[PDB]
Ligand binder design. Structure first.
Ligand SMILES: [Zn+2]
Ligand SMILES: [Zn+2]
Length: 2002
């Protein structure tokens, strides 16, 4: 009403002190005798006591906290009350949770832990009586005083000057005396003001709410001992601030980093082997040493903290740190420190900064030129370098060559406009209520004139109204050219309040021109340049940020060191001080060049250097001369000149400078540098990843190498940043792959965590001046609770705490509510019954949208946003009713969700047009809208006062034509409030709206003093509150209203209908709760839950949600909807920043046809006319724009159109998989429900209702409400009142701006993706899933051929730009090349890739022969393969002949807006016909030049057979009673890619043949089987095809993490493509994943036996290929079979168990474990890989050990390379391919072409090769060696000349050339018969394929050399994971050999091939110079493991939307 509860402004004890002065003897204050203090002096004399003053204040403060000698009572009673109320309200939540997540809860009291409750009772005693003192000393009215006096037992005492001294007795401190703003005295003899008292209230209530929040949770994360430990921490903290006064906060400023350091230490304990970084801990230790040199016990503090054993408790402490906090600021020392840190003279390297500036210019030139493909430089330049050629051509845009050539002069050019200055109309985009200083003459005159009084800050809005507006154009123009005038350069300082630094570090406020300057330039920055930089999270809302928080790939103790992201975070000193001109100048010069006005934005440090600085808190001390303030008294309280700094100015700008330094110094090592820059404070994620560590000392060394690399980066950054004059510290920190800290938000391991302590330590705090009301405190507990919910895991602790802190608050306001000025117990007579179940529930539970007060629904913890408050809560209430196990809850459901509707008025519709979705209620008069009404009213009733023409004309327009718009809008019968609102905003009235709204509540009541309105607003507040509470008392009608709806969405509609006159467009969305209802658990039957059909969402949690925050989690994510919102993470101004007016009008014209059509012409001529009033009439009309889209969620103006966001931790959402693709069957009309919200809801509800489960799980959601599932329509409104936009605003427009068949789908999305992929921005869902709102049916080869078309065109266009015109050689190669690049880029790109996983497109990709995948769900890898493969097939057909586009009717679609497609598409048909046609040159060059200029100016059962059947090496075995145990040779292990390669016709794997060999020789007849442990279903497919009449049970460990399923189910096992798409014979096909697919445990067996008794299978056969990695898991599964076997397996039945030789000789024989009637084991070659211990155990079910030993000697691992090799020859002799149909095999060239293309060569070469392979089957060897050559020369270049070719072994290229050499030389050795190749091969694959590196100088720069037999630099390559591609090699070349013979290696031919395909290089250059001839018989012994010296790239961490 007047002043503030909780804390606003800093401490500054000087006030108190000088009052002690004036009081005491008159030691004299300074100048403040002016003050009215004599009231307090009358208190001081009338009650004589004596103060203590400051340091002592903080002493007794420390003492007084946590004290026992005290009273208690009110504490006990209060808390018990809270307890009771909360029990009731928890009745409500009880039924909610329990009906929602099936888990029931009991209300745990807070009395349970005893001592905790005692502690908390003392704190409550203290807080509650501090709440009283708060209340009293902040009240103006004698009435409030008398009511509080009667309520709180105190009394009024009038003092002689007419000053009321209240006297109060309170149980903590005993007696107290209180007067205007001043307090206390006797008992503890102390004086205090509002500021000090309140910060103490903040303290105690912090401790209170934190202890409260933790003490009893549902999860027990705490015990009274832990709490005892935190309490101890408070005790210690106290003891510090006890021992001395304010100085302790040094040591506290130490507390929060000590906390940081314990955190780091834990998250380091995570993956133990990493070196710690001594830096930070050491620094800390030193700070504790010095701290303990002053005062110890900080020692004990630090110690006990780091003694804390938990994550949580630590995080709490770090969550507090501010407790026992907030010391007095000394602004003197503050200003000294500041001014010095400014004055500091900095060494600056200039040309360094200039090089940065250049780097930037390069950046945005690239971006712009990759956007509009129009170089933005002038053609005025020197006819040289790149530029002339460049801009003239419209692309020279150069290469590495011309970039190296070009110095970094990018900052020197003639740079043009580029970014256009957005129109700022309405204040929203500029102004907030922050203040600013008055001009120079005036401040100076307010120092000369009344001195003693601090000079005020002129509120931005008050000056916005009273001063003539800004001409943005002339402003910037004149600032640019001549700069600002002296009288506008002034900066005021205010000590910001919370800092905890004894320094105080003053926040700044400018003068009006400086204000506007910094704002508009800041806004140009953020709008244009901010986005050109990754990292720098400013514009980011939340979801985006969290994505940027998952730009830390941290965590993973699971995978351990196989990938790591180190994390640096840096703080500087004063970033916002040490900023300097001579550094910042060039870059901001560049930025200036860019935004229209050169040398504009560079004037920052100039305006600082010229300006005045002063601290408006002490004007007395400043003296006036020469338009200068001088310090006089020598405190440095003001000064002239500055070298820059002061906080929030060019935050973004200086941050872009730094971030550029980083991106420049990132280049040094190519290390992966990810960055997050929040203003000052920044973090650098440094990514590395490892290749499969072996000896564990490698981890030590390698990780220490990651550290070394890291420290190098940091050092380069230190020096670099240092050159600019920014001091970086060696005490500023970093952590390992774990932790990270960003803007005080912790990420721990791989996961975000909030400070529940902090949010709950806020609670009852009310924001500035707002004061607590029924609405406000509830609003606070609410928002903070939803925050907690949002950051934590399953949002429950937030719900129960909500209930608690809510009813805590409610009892506080029941005690007294400052709004009603008296207690609410006392008020019963006035207003209806406040004390009821009704009122309680209402106050804390019904939403405002149903029309009651406030406090959520408990439905909002679910979807973070969602656009239907009404439906949401009404749905909630129906739901709590239906699951209510009581009566009065039902009573409350009817009561609540039948809101009494007030009778319609055009007034109300004005309100609920201004905001949509809501309803007309018998209350709802908010202080908000009432104050909006009042400020509208006042602002309107003075339109003649306003000195601003923008605002004047806006107010006029309002006062005149608002009615016209009102009625005109209101007459549209299909009532479309979204459109009425967007139009309403988009009309020139958007100004009126912006400003009227712009005033924030408290700031408004502060700014409403502008006029006669003083009392009205206060009694209006009283009006609103009495009415509110009156509405609840009224809401005790119980049961009086109607009943339980049916599916409240339809009823929310009907209620909206009854609310208004008519029905509404249907903008209401049934929300997930009522429609999807509780979850069906598929682990249970769910069979009645089956609707058949797909009315079914599902979610998977493999491994389950059990323990989270403890690891990152495997699965990718799901964040939410796409479009952003208002940022709630910070508080600068930013809410309405989005979407100015011209853009609005433009966009609702970009609506038109959608829901209106031009045919309507009325609303339309109107729309265009709005666009004509804002602008002029630029309308060309529009036609053919028909849009079929949904009208509820989607329609908006560029703003949030969204469906919702996840309110949940990333944690569970990382352990889950949401699946959508199951629902394709609701395609229907493409109607209401939000897939976004639904998916989100499934996620949360799943997490909540699982809450921990380790057995994994699968969950079903089937639509319960088919009725309010609600099919849509498309209504196109028109109506009319015959309205026209009046009052032409072109005056304003002057002053405002500164002049700102499916082949068709294929071509559309494919060209769109080509072009967009070249622009490099948004890949999101524009490649969508299956028939869209664009409709369709067939999506075939039609879709794909078209895709190739549109895409090819897109590459046509990008290739006219991409290349120099005057070089035309073979344009075919140009365009072909571009499209190749695109295709690869697309096969990597995921959304399209899942799109091709699922659906009928798979077919068109399964028609072409490829190869089967292996990965069960088929990873992005195998998908990329298949996609590429098919495309190389079709594109091959292109590279040969001509490309026809068929069709040629360009069907543009509704999903393509404007010309981003149109122009280039037309131009691309012509351009394909021009460019791909000739294979030549002509006049076309002219045409290219022309058209490219126009573009840049335009943007102004399958057949089958027999198969390989092998030999069985048999081991019969018996077990008779007694053992003869253990004596056995344990085999060796060779990995021998050999035979794994010789298997030729392999489907996903040749285990296929193995099983054939079993069921061949071992003689099984199985009618039906169970195949478990198949990856893609290989052995399944095998069995199933082999015995055609068999049925089978498929089981696969579901390998998820390696693939991103974007809204899709993992799909069938790929292998079952084998059966020709008819999998019907495999019963478990297509459903496989949704059961317990885990074989490690039981329940899977219960499920199989289910499937046995279910389909009557009888399961003759069991087969398990485990591929066992764990003895544990093995013994586990052994026990499983041991249990379930002979109750599942049949009576003649069979069990095959694949076993490992080492593992069976190892310890616990599974052979022993399982012994049935006939028992054996076998080895089967003519299948099995060479030198292999692996063997198939066997049981037919229904001495010996020495024979076992014998057989083990007859086993393969034992046997040697002659057995190995000769056996593989035998296999070579077998026809391994045979009955395989061609669909399955690769094309026995295309695999070669693509492989050589996998190994880095050009496709042309690949193809010439593959041809030569085709042509020369006879002489193969020559061609093979030629592959060796070609891969070698294109990888490592044994020949060429160049200037400095550094280390091009560089890991990978060397890797793939090594493996190439291996596979090749393998099958070569097998052909050419040479053993020592083979021996070598084995020893190599085992260890270290040599690559010995050199660079020799023959001049011309220098040549490069690689070898083996020599020793250079050894990049020697390990191969472990590499058998697979070796296999590919052997397979391919065995596959092209086609059983055909071979002929001698023909050296002549080799030469032919070599010089043909390559430079002229020869067998010679290969022979000696550098090469692989070593692979004749020659090599060297092992040297390096150093590919295990790892590398760096970037990390792939996927979430969906932003
Ligand atoms: Zn429903
Ligand atoms: Zn189901």
């Amino acid at each position: 009403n007047h002043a503030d509860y909780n804390l606003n402004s800093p401490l500054i004890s000087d006030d108190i002190d000088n009052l002690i002065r004036k009081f005491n003897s008159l030691p004299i204050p300074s100048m403040w005798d002016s003050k009215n203090w004599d009231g307090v002096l009358e208190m001081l004399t009338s009650c004589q006591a004596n103060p203590i003053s400051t340091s002592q204040m903080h002493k007794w403060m420390g003492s007084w906290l946590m004290s026992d000698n005290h009273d208690a009572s009110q504490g006990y009673s209060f808390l018990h009350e809270v307890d009771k109320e909360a029990e009731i309200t928890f009745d409500v939540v009880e039924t909610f949770i329990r009906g929602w997540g099936n888990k029931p809860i009991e209300y745990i009291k807070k009395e349970r832990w005893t001592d905790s409750f005692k502690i908390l009772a003392y704190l409550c005693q203290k807080f509650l009586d501090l709440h009283k003192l708060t209340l009293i000393l902040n009240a103006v009215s004698e009435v409030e005083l008398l009511n509080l006096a009667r309520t709180f037992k105190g009394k009024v005492r009038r003092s002689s000057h007419g000053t009321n001294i209240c006297r109060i007795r309170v149980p903590s401190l005993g007696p107290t005396f209180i007067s205007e703003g001043w307090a206390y005295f006797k008992k503890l003899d102390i004086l205090m003001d509002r500021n000090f008292l309140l910060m103490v209230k903040d303290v105690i209530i912090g401790r209170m709410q934190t202890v409260l929040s933790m003490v009893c949770r549902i999860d027990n994360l705490f015990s009274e001992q832990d709490i005892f430990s935190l309490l101890n921490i408070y005790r210690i903290g106290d003891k510090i601030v006890e021992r001395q006064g304010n100085f302790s906060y040094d040591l506290i400023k130490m507390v929060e980093p000590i906390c940081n350091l314990k955190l780091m230490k834990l998250a380091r304990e995570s993956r133990p082997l990493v070196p710690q970084f001594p830096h930070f801990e050491n620094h800390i230790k030193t700070s504790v040493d010095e701290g303990a040199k002053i005062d110890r016990g900080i020692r004990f503090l630090h110690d006990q903290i780091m003694s804390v054993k938990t994550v949580d408790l630590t995080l709490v402490i770090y969550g507090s740190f501010r407790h026992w906090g907030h010391p007095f600021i000394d602004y003197y020392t503050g200003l000294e420190k500041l001014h010095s840190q400014v004055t500091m003279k900095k060494d600056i390297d200039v040309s360094y900064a200039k090089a940065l500036a250049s780097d930037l210019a390069r950046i945005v030139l690239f971006q712009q030129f990759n956007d509009h493909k129009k170089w933005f430089v002038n053609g005025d330049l020197l006819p040289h370098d790149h530029p002339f050629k460049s801009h003239v051509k419209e692309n020279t845009w150069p290469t590495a060559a011309q970039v190296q050539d070009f110095g970094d002069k990018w900052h020197e050019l003639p740079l043009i406009k580029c970014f256009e200055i957005p129109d700022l109309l309405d204040p929203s985009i500029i102004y907030s209520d922050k203040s600013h200083s008055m001009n120079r003459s005036e401040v100076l005159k307010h120092v000369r004139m009344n001195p003693n009084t601090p000079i005020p800050s002129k509120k931005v809005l008050q000056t916005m109204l009273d001063t003539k507006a800004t001409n943005w154009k002339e402003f910037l123009k004149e600032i640019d050219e001549k700069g600002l005038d002296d009288d506008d350069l002034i900066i005021g300082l205010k000590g910001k309040e919370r800092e905890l630094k004894l320094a105080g570090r003053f926040f700044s406020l400018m003068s009006w021109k400086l204000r506007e300057y910094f704002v508009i330039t800041e806004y140009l920055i953020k709008t244009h340049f901010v986005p050109m930089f990754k990292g720098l999270t400013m514009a980011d809302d939340l979801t985006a940020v969290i994505k940027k928080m998952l730009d830390s790939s941290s965590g993973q103790g699971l995978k351990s060191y196989e990938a790591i992201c180190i994390a640096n975070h840096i703080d500087y000193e004063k970033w916002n001080n040490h900023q300097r001109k001579l550094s910042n100048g060039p870059v901001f010069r560049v930025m200036g060049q860019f935004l229209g006005y050169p040398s504009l934005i560079e004037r920052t440090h100039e305006f600082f250097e010229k300006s005045l600085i002063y601290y408006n808190g002490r004007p007395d001390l400043m003296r006036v001369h020469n338009n200068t303030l001088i310090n006089s008294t020598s405190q440095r309280v003001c000064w002239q000149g500055q070298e820059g700094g002061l906080e929030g100015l060019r935050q973004k700008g200086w941050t872009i400078l730094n971030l550029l330094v980083i991106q420049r110094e990132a280049k040094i090592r190519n290390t992966a540098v990810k960055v997050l820059a929040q203003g000052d404070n920044q973090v650098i994620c440094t990514q590395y990843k490892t290749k499969k560590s072996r000896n564990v000392v490698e981890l030590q060394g390698a990780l220490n190498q990651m550290v070394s690399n890291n420290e190098k980066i940091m050092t380069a950054i230190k020096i670099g940043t240092g050159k600019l004059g920014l001091l970086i510290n060696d005490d500023e920190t970093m952590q390992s792959a774990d932790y990270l800290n960003y803007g005080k938000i912790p990420i721990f391991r791989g996961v975000i965590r909030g400070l529940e302590t902090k949010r709950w330590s806020r609670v009852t705090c009310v924001t500035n001046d707002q004061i607590p009301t029924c609405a406000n405190i509830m609003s606070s507990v609410s928002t903070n609770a939803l925050t907690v919910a949002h950051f934590a895991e399953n949002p429950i602790n937030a719900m129960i705490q909500y209930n608690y802190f809510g009813t805590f608050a409610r009892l506080l306001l029941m005690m007294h509510d400052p709004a009603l000025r008296q207690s609410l117990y006392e008020v019963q007579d006035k207003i209806p019954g406040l004390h009821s179940s009704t009122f309680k529930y209402a106050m804390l539970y019904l939403d405002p949208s149903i029309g009651g007060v406030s406090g959520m629904s408990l439905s909002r913890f679910l979807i973070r946003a969602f656009p239907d408050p009404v439906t949401e809560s009404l749905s909630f209430w129906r739901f709590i009713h239906v699951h209510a196990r009581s009566e009065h809850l039902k009573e409350m459901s009817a009561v609540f969700g039948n809101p009494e509707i007030a009778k319609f008025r055009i007034t109300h519709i004005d309100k609920l047009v201004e905001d949509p979705t809501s309803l007309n209620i018998a209350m709802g008069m908010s202080p908000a809208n009432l104050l909006k009404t009042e400020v509208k009213k006042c602002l309107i009733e003075s339109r003649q006062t306003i000195r601003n023409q923008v605002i004047k004309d806006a107010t006029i327009y309002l006062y005149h034509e608002e009615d016209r718009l009102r009625s005109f809008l209101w007459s549209i019968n299909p009532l479309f409030p979204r459109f009425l609102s967007e139009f309403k905003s988009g009309t020139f009235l958007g100004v009126a709206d912006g400003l009227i709204s712009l005033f924030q509540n408290s700031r408004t009541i502060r700014n409403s003093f502008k006029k006669k309105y003083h009392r009205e607003l206060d009694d209006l507040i009283v009006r609103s509150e009495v009415s509110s509470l009156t509405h609840l008392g009224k809401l005790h009608l119980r049961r009086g209203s109607c009943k339980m709806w049916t599916c409240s969405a339809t009823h929310a509609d009907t209620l909206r209908y009854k609310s208004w006159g008519r029905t509404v467009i249907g903008t209401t969305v049934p929300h997930p709760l009522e429609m999807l209802g509780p979850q069906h658990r598929k682990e249970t039957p769910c069979a009645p839950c089956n609707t058949s059909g797909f009315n079914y969402v599902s979610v998977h949690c493999p491994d389950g949600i059990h323990d989270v925050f403890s690891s990152r989690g495997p699965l990718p994510a799901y964040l939410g909807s796409k479009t952003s919102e208002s940022t709630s993470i910070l508080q600068p101004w930013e809410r309405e920043s989005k979407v100015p007016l011209i853009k609005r009008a433009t966009r609702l014209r970009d609506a038109i046809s959608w829901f209106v059509e031009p045919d309507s012409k009325l609303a339309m001529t109107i729309l265009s006319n709005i666009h004509s009033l804002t602008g002029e009439e630029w309308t060309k009309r529009q036609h053919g724009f028909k849009r079929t889209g949904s009208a509820l969620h989607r329609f908006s103006t560029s703003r949030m159109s969204h469906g919702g966001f996840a309110s949940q931790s990333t944690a569970a959402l990382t352990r889950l998989m949401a699946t959508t693709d199951t629902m394709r069957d609701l395609g229907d009309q493409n109607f209401d429900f939000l897939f976004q919200a639904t998916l989100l809801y499934a996620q949360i509800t799943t997490t909540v209702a699982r809450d921990g489960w380790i057995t994994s799980c699968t969950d079903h959601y089937h639509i319960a409400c088919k009725s309010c599932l609600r099919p849509i329509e498309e209504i196109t409104l028109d109506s009319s009142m015959d309205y026209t936009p009046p009052d032409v605003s072109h005056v304003l427009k002057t002053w405002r701006n500164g002049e700102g068949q499916s082949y068709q789908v294929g071509r559309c999305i494919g060209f769109l993706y080509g072009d967009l992929a070249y622009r490099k921005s948004t890949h999101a869902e524009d490649s969508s899933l299956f028939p869209l709102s664009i409709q369709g049916r067939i999506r075939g080869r039609g879709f794909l051929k078209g895709l190739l078309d549109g895409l090819m065109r897109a590459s046509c266009c990008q290739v006219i730009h991409r290349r120099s015109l005057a070089h035309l050689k073979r344009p075919a190669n140009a365009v072909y090349g571009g499209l190749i690049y695109l295709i690869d880029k697309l096969s990597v790109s995921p959304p399209f890739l899942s799109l091709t996983r699922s659906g009928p497109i798979r077919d068109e990709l399964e028609t072409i022969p490829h190869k089967i995948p292996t990965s069960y769900p088929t990873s992005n890898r195998d998908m990329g393969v298949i996609v590429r493969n098919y495309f190389k097939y079709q594109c091959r057909l292109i590279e040969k002949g001509k490309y026809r586009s068929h069709y040629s009717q360009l069907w543009l679609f509704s999903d393509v807006l404007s010309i981003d497609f149109i122009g280039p598409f037309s131009i691309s048909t012509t351009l394909l016909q021009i460019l791909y046609k000739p294979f030549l040159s002509g006049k076309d060059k002219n045409e290219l030049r022309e058209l490219a200029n126009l573009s840049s100016l335009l943007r102004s059962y399958p057949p089958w057979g027999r198969e390989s059947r092998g030999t069985i090496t048999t081991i019969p075995v018996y077990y008779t009673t007694t053992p003869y145990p253990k004596m056995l040779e344990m085999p060796p292990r060779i990995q021998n890619p050999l035979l794994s390669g010789i298997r030729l016709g392999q489907l996903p794997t040749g285990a296929h043949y193995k099983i054939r060999s079993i069921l061949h020789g071992m003689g099984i007849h199985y009618r039906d089987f169970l195949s478990c442990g198949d990856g893609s279903g290989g052995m399944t497919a095998a069995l199933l095809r082999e015995n055609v009449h068999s049925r089978g049970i498929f089981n696969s460990l579901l390998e998820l993490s390696g693939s991103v399923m974007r809204g899709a189910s993992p799909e069938p096992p790929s292998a079952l493509e084998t059966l020709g798409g008819d999998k019907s014979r495999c019963v478990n096909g297509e459903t496989c994943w949704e059961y317990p697919s885990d074989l490690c445990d039981p329940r899977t067996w219960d499920y199989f036996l289910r499937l046995k008794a279910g389909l009557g299978l009888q399961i003759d056969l069991i087969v398990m290929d485990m591929e066992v990695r764990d003895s544990s898991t093995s013994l586990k599964i052994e026990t499983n079979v041991r249990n379930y076997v002979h109750r599942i397996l049949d009576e003649q039945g069979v069990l095959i168990y694949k076993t490992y030789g080492t593992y069976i000789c190892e310890s616990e024989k599974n052979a022993v474990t399982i012994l049935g009637p006939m028992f054996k084991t076998v080895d089967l070659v003519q299948t099995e890989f060479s030198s292999s211990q692996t063997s198939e155990v066997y049981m037919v079910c229904k001495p010996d050990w020495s024979s076992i030993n014998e057989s083990w000697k007859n086993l393969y691992a034992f046997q040697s390379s002659e057995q190995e090799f000769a056996r593989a020859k035998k296999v070579s002799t077998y026809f391994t391919l045979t009955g395989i149909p061609s669909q399955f095999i690769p094309d026995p060239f295309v695999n070669i072409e693509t492989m050589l293309q996998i190994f880095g060569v050009p496709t042309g070469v690949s193809h010439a090769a593959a041809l030569k392979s085709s042509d020369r089957p006879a002489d193969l060897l020559t061609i093979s060696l030629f592959y060796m050559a070609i891969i070698s020369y294109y990888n490592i270049n044994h020949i060429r000349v160049g200037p400095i070719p550094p280390n091009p072994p560089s890991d990978g290229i060397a890797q793939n050339v090594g493996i190439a050499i291996t596979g090749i030389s393998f099958w070569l050795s097998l052909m050419e018969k040479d053993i020592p190749l083979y021996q070598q091969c084995l020893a190599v694959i085992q260890q270290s394929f040599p690559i010995r590196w050199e660079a020799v100088s023959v001049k011309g720069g220098y040549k490069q050399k690689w070898s083996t037999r020599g020793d250079g630099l050894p990049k020697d390559t390990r191969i472990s994971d590499s058998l697979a591609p070796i296999g590919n090699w052997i397979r391919s070349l065995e596959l092209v050999r086609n059983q055909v013979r071979l002929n001698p290696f023909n050296e002549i031919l080799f030469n032919q091939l070599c010089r043909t395909v390559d430079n002229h290089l020869k067998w010679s250059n290969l022979r000696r110079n550098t090469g692989m001839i070593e692979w004749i018989n020659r090599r060297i012994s092992k040297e390096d493991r150093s590919i295990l010296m790892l590398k760096s790239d970037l990390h792939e961490e996927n979430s969906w939307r932003d």
